[PDB]
C-alpha cells in the first residue's frame, strides 16, 4: 500500500555521530550563524548649499503646519569647539551675574 508521509526519523548513534562531526567542523572553522550587533567641488558644493537652505525652510514650515507633532532628525555626533572665557562673559547683559568660573575645567586646562 502507499503511505502518506515519511515517518519521524529514529535518532540512532550514526545520525548523532554525523551531526556531532558537522558541529565540530563548524565550531573549529567558526562558521557561526549568529546575530551581529548593529571638499568635493565648487559647483557641487553650492548645489548642496542651495538645497540645504531649501530643506531647512521647508522642514520649518512643515513642522509648523503639522502643529509641531513631528518625528525628529535621526542623529548627529557633531563637533564643538569652546574657547576658555569667564562665565561672566558667557552671560546676558544685565547688572548682575550668576557665576564667575571659567568655562574650561582644570582637567581641560
Amino acid at each position: 500500500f502507499d503511505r502518506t508521509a515519511k515517518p519521524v526519523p529514529v535518532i540512532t548513534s550514526e545520525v548523532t555521530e554525523s551531526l556531532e562531526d558537522m558541529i565540530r567542523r563548524r565550531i573549529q572553522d567558526s562558521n557561526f550563524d549568529d546575530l551581529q550587533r548593529r571638499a568635493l567641488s565648487e559647483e557641487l558644493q553650492k548645489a548642496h548649499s542651495e538645497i540645504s537652505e531649501l530643506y531647512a525652510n521647508l522642514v520649518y514650515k512643515l513642522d509648523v503646519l503639522s502643529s509641531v507633532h513631528f518625528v525628529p532628525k535621526p542623529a548627529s555626533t557633531s563637533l564643538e569647539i569652546r574657547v576658555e572665557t569667564p562665565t561672566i562673559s558667557m552671560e546676558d547683559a544685565q547688572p548682575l551675574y550668576m557665576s564667575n568660573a571659567s568655562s574650561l575645567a582644570p582637567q581641560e586646562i
Binding site: 567641488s41 559647483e43 557641487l44 548645489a47
Partner: protein, 124 residues
C-alpha cells in the same frame, strides 16, 4: 565605435559646453546638463524599438507662435551658415530637410518645440 563612454561624450559634447577642467562623467554632472543628458540618452535608447509617432512628441505650441519660433530659428541658422558658408572650415553637414543644430538650439531647447525638421514637408 563600441566604446560607450567615449561616444556618449562625443554626442553630448554640445550641451555640456552649453551648460557647464570640465566634467563629463555621470556622478559629477550637476543640474541642467544632467537632466538634458539623461533625456538625450533615454531618447537615443528608445528610438530603436519604440514607434516613430510615439518617441518624439513635440510640446504643444500654438500655430502662430510656433511658426514664428521656426522662422526666427531659420533666420539664425541662415545667418550663421551664410556667415561662414564661403569659409573653408569643416562646417558640419546636415541632411536636406533638417534644421542645422546650433548653439541656440542647445541652449534655447528649441527642438522640443519645433522638432528636427518640418515633418509635413518630410512626409510630402
Amino acid at each position: 565605435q563600441n566604446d560607450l563612454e567615449l561616444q556618449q561624450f562625443l554626442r553630448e559634447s554640445h550641451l555640456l559646453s552649453a551648460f557647464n577642467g570640465i566634467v563629463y562623467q555621470d556622478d559629477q554632472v550637476i543640474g541642467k546638463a544632467r537632466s538634458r543628458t539623461l533625456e538625450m540618452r533615454l531618447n537615443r535608447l528608445s528610438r530603436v524599438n519604440g514607434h516613430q509617432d510615439k518617441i518624439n512628441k513635440l510640446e504643444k505650441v500654438p500655430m502662430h507662435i510656433r511658426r514664428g519660433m521656426i522662422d526666427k530659428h531659420v533666420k539664425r541658422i541662415k545667418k550663421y551658415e551664410q556667415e561662414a558658408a564661403e569659409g573653408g572650415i569643416v562646417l558640419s553637414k546636415v541632411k536636406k530637410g533638417q534644421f542645422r543644430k546650433i548653439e541656440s538650439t542647445y541652449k534655447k531647447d528649441i527642438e522640443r518645440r519645433i522638432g528636427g525638421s518640418i515633418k509635413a514637408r518630410d512626409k510630402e
